[PDB]
């Protein structure tokens, strides 16, 4: 039930395919006790419903691009797979869920696992003991009703994306099993390995070996009555950087357990309105991603969809990429860590979230937790975030605040960053004002001069100024435009506009003191019931550089143009 | 009209996006003169379409998984397009369609440009005084209705995926320009290039200029009065092979055109059963791919497509792929080239073609010459395939006879296959007895023994031997699967099954004496209406390695294993 | 497989409901022996189809408003029906399917029982010997490719309905059993009925009695030979009338066999210009009804959609329906017999009929025949079509000519009709010029002034002489609206314009003289792939006067206006 580190360098065995299911929108499926996955075989008696006979769907998946039924369902889904597995006595097992949006609840052969909410963060339980010889059947119920309450809340901009929406794995243990790690420079230490270790299960107190071979490292320390053990290590690796993205292969050992990673080391830090990656001043050429594939737009979770969407953004000329709304599957991660990605990394607080509700704060504080501790080894993210815009207020800063003294406490090293209240100083000339800053690393904002405020013109006749000299981040701005669609530089959703407005606010930017990063929204096209406008959006935010047929419009050349002046110009 | 060489590197202009469409199964468009593309603004008249408010499809793609109610459909539908553009005065403007299934008709401004049949080859119209200043209108009537004279005929293994499935492109040209140029390695000659080009237009008599400045080359020729041109030029270029797919920057010009292309050298030859490639004998371990992209199974066409696909190949361990069952999209031919993947490229020839028909035959031979023409500077392809599974009577040898030295005719220096007909030499013994055999330099063919014939240990059973000491090359193999479903090896469609079958099966193929290729069919699970079990097939072939969602079945390892033993064993 | 007389008043079985399905465009099914209907439970063997877990549809339907997928499709869908049944020895057991659109192929148990060519009209095989105990399987695969040669041909301007689209009977008789019979009055007799009776089986020599009680009717013959009696009966029933629709119950015994009937009696004959209806002259007061339902727009079959049909006619004013363009169901022309519709029945020859291919002429001629054999009791149909509008040729002539001899031949009494071809004597001024108008009793032709022929203005300025003094009647006029589309009676398809056109054209139908009958086109919106006009026609025929959800038009209450004044003027 605790997260498992590094889940694809385990023993593992896929459940993914295709699954029996049973939409259930007035929830009486509960009632029906249908998690018994009784096949109706005997008609003698009365039974009202049989996965045995019912329709598939791929799992993983979104489940609203796979039917057109399906399209805007919010209410429960129940999925059944039925799988064998031969443990060894002594061995455990684990089942482990990538994502599932937004609430599941699990049973197997019959019996109630668990629960879990938030549709973004990885999700594991012990079947050890109830797994059985022959058919096995786990049962998911699972639902993505928008309530108030949660996180995120009712509305936002980006679709109600249900199901089991990455990977579901068996994850076979050792009896005593590494359970977690880190393994990182020591902050601001370009010549110091830092880390920890943490076994569990029952033989606690074990030696371990961290091994890097190609830094010819070899430390053996020794576990305590918690299972837990950390080190120092000097050391002098190549440091990770965008344009050489060095990993290091490294491998745990205890006496019972094994697990080998693929891990890189850089330091990270800020140096007044300067952003320096191991002590060089970078510029962050960044570009925003939903987790959205290309072509069909459902939900993204392959190695095969973070490369396609990562090689836009590489021909755009980015060295960084922020992935909105919330925690992005782990192979997009992955994937920008060996392409050579900075990565900023949220979660979706968002607008109204219920600020007074105790529950609400412990489920965006969960999904924190969960996101840093899947992803803390990855060194090729630079900013975690713990939100977007939000509406200023004492209870908002106390919950945000509260987050982001959490984030600094599971990670010192990596920049804490949130969208600050814009305000306006003189006719013409806005900076930020937010209190939150001051537990912030970054200043970082959205705005969207020359498309919600104004037409593209507006761009030359705004400027910006801060009152504090930390690093300036523009985390959203941009425009809509249909591919294909042509008209006037002054008509509205045309490509000319979208490449109208780039231009005069890539002149913006350029006045900008203290800019050191830039993730325009967005990539590519993406689903959003917000969206209206017929044949033009189609409910598509249509503020993508690229289509959602991957084609590039004319102003994704614009910010290549201007990527390359700022390749040179760091170079 | 004539075919244009290396598109992508004229000066383009896309007419790509979502246009207007009137699906049309009565055909009583053309009656109606819908070409003319008169929007219905006067009510006061009776007219009985109207494109400006009709419904949107997407340009490029099949239509069938654009909308459920074209899943299935075949016969008409009408595209339409609005664009302006501006050519200067003395400049020509062609439009180029990348492919379109199966037969176009296509109108600007209400004047018929022409016709093309043959769903997987492009083709040209010159609009340079069609154009208008203002709005223009293109009209495409697409009909993928099944006709018996067809190549391919009604029936075929694959999804009948009509639309205008490739992009669409204006093309701008000078008065007299480049229109084709052949670029390549002399006949088995490491030192030397040799090729020609062709200028059209009115100066046809020109001097041109061919640079690799790598290889510090820069020849000049003059053009003849028919705008020809040819030359040998001693170089000694560093050669193209899988491991180092090496490719030189070639930029030609004339004293009015330019055009630059990215192109590798090689030789290819055989040697009794050895396949030489730059002289060193080579294994072609292969995998057949169709046109259709993971996840959505729609018709290939993007450079993301083909990455995807022969990132799968990569990782199975192919230095080669085959490109059923017609020429795909260029851009599947540039990546493998760039990624490293010899290509066996073909025509959608196979058993029920009207062997006796001439306009089948001409459109055969056709489709033959604009495959050739088009990638005829790509050195990846070795090996031009006029031919699957065919039935051995007198008029399909003349027919497939007239391809083979049409084929060689138009190239003298790759290698020439056609699928052979096998038969039994004794219970036990297979071999091949085809009289085509003369006029191909391979001996290839297609066997399913282990699941067409016999069950998976038959593939124990059987032997192999050849009457003539030519290479062998296995076009097709392989076993049906669904990913995610399991059982005994014994179960037919389960994942145990194709993985027992895979490991007997290349069992069988390291006893094959001569044996020097395979590309098992096939990567990933394509669709078919001949595939009918329910939950298992549901209309997709299930012979990929891959799932069509992007998963690797336990055969997948099995054939990685021995590519890995080959390619240890050939270096 | 000859077809037997009143099927439902017989010993009855349905075997309606959801049958499983397999779509199959490739039509590989047949080389499957999909017929065989071999459950897949044994996953040892390879197989590649499974009816007992395929997907359903229902039975009698269109297939093309079931599924999305199928609203397009022309081609093979496979229908299979599991059924059992318990035939006391020496009883007889027949199939009988009352409509499949366009050719049925019918398999039981594996064996071929035939094949069936025609949509409309039913067919019978007989199943005595080739029923199992326990189950038996019903194999139909059912194919509506359009084709030159068939009958209606490639294109005509009503949707292509394919699929079981009539209910499917089984039928047990008596070892000797009556199979047709005819009870009517003899030509122009109000005082004589004349009959026949026709036995089918082994004991073909058998006293048979024909009773019909409320005219103290009984009268007994004996069969010849081969099963055959005549018989002439002086009597006065009360003659049926649209407003007196009386049926008198008739009940036919033999030996061994009985079935009840409700039949009616009248006498129809033409007087120069007018038509005799029981020796009182009459105006059809018409509308044309396609086979379609309201609300849904699907394939009509039942009472339920006769009766609401008929309901609405019944609302305009009619005494009179044309049931276009083929036979329709039984339960139309029964529904229609029972509430007071005279009927005008006809078969699909249209246009563009292959009029010198022998085997269309066949086709049509079997199609005619079927007609007329099944319905040749009911008294309120009294006019058979042999063509709609034809093009005047003389292989055309020579076809119809044929037709109408044989229509003749089979029906002394009915009245012949044919859409005949127009011709403009001056400027303003129609009429009639068709050779093959001698050989039928009225003058009929379709006519468009005011919508294809002109703005409704031009209704003001036509009028119509005839050079032969025969009953003129129109079987075709009117124009489209959509309902709740309001405009300037200028503006094509609003409401307004459809009023003022009808209200123009009554104008103009009340000066033709000779005019005996109206049938404009058409009751309800109908499907046709010819209708492009987006969000006013979407495939529909808007010509209706009642929408295809049942609302009335503007126009007709100007129908229904002139109708009331004709039954005012015709008492
Ligand atoms: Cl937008
Ligand atoms: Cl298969
Ligand atoms: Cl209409």
Wanted: a neutral charge.
């Amino acid at each position: 039930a605790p997260q498992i580190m590094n889940v694809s360098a385990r023993q593992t065995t896929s459940l993914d395919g295709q699954w029996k299911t049973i939409v259930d929108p007035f929830e009486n499926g509960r009632g029906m006790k249908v998690y018994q996955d009784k096949t109706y075989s005997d008609k003698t008696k009365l039974q009202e419903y049989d996965f045995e006979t019912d329709k598939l769907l791929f799992v993983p998946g979104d489940w609203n691009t796979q039917r057109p039924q399906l399209y805007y369902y919010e209410g429960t889904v129940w999925y059944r797979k039925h799988f064998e597995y031969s443990l060894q006595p002594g061995k455990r097992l684990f089942l482990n869920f990538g994502a599932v949006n937004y609430e599941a609840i699990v049973w197997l052969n019959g019996k109630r696992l668990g629960r879990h909410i938030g549709g973004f963060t990885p999700f594991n339980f012990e079947i050890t003991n109830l797994l059985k010889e022959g058919t096995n059947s786990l049962v998911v119920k699972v639902d993505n009703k928008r309530l108030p309450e949660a996180v995120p809340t009712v509305n936002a901009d980006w679709w109600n994306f249900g199901g089991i929406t990455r990977p579901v794995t068996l994850i076979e243990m050792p009896a005593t099993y590494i359970r977690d790690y880190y393994v990182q420079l020591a902050k601001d230490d370009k010549n110091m390995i830092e880390g920890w270790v943490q076994l569990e299960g029952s033989d606690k107190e074990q030696k371990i070996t961290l091994d890097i071979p190609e830094l010819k490292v070899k430390k053996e320390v020794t576990t305590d009555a918690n299972g837990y053990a950390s080190f120092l290590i000097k050391s002098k690796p190549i440091l990770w950087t965008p344009e050489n993205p060095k990993l290091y292969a490294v491998n745990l050992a205890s006496e019972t357990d094994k697990v080998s990673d693929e891990i890189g080391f850089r330091t990270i830090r800020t140096e007044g309105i300067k952003i320096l990656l191991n002590d060089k001043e970078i510029f962050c050429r960044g570009i925003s991603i939903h987790e959205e594939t290309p072509y069909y737009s459902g939900r993204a979770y392959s190695k095969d969809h973070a490369h396609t969407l990562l090689s836009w953004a590489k021909e755009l000329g980015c060295n960084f990429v922020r992935l909105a709304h919330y925690p992005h599957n782990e192979e997009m991660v992955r994937e920008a860590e060996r392409m050579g990605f900075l990565v900023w990394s949220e979660i979706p607080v968002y607008w109204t979230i219920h600020w007074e509700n105790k529950d609400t704060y412990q489920n965006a504080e969960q999904q924190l937790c969960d996101m840093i501790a899947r992803d803390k080894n990855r060194c090729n993210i630079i900013i975690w975030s713990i939100a977007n815009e939000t509406p200023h207020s004492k209870t908002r800063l106390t919950f945000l605040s509260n987050l982001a003294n959490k984030a600094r406490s599971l990670d010192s090293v990596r920049l804490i960053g949130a969208a600050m209240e814009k305000e306006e100083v003189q006719p013409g000339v806005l900076t930020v004002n937010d209190p939150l800053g001051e537990l912030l690393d970054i200043i970082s904002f959205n705005e969207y001069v020359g498309w919600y405020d104004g037409d593209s013109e507006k761009c030359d006749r705004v400027n910006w100024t801060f009152d504090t000299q930390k690093p300036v981040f523009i985390s959203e701005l941009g425009g809509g435009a249909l591919y294909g669609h042509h008209g006037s530089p002054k008509e509205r959703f045309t490509e000319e506009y979208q490449e109208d407005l780039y231009i005069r606010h890539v002149n913006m930017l350029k006045r900008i003191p203290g800019l050191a990063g830039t993730t325009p929204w967005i990539l590519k096209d993406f689903r959003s019931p917000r969206r209206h406008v017929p044949e033009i959006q189609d409910d598509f935010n249509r503020k993508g550089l690229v289509s959602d047929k991957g084609q590039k419009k004319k102003a994704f050349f614009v910010l290549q143009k201007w990527y390359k002046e700022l390749t040179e110009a760091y170079k």
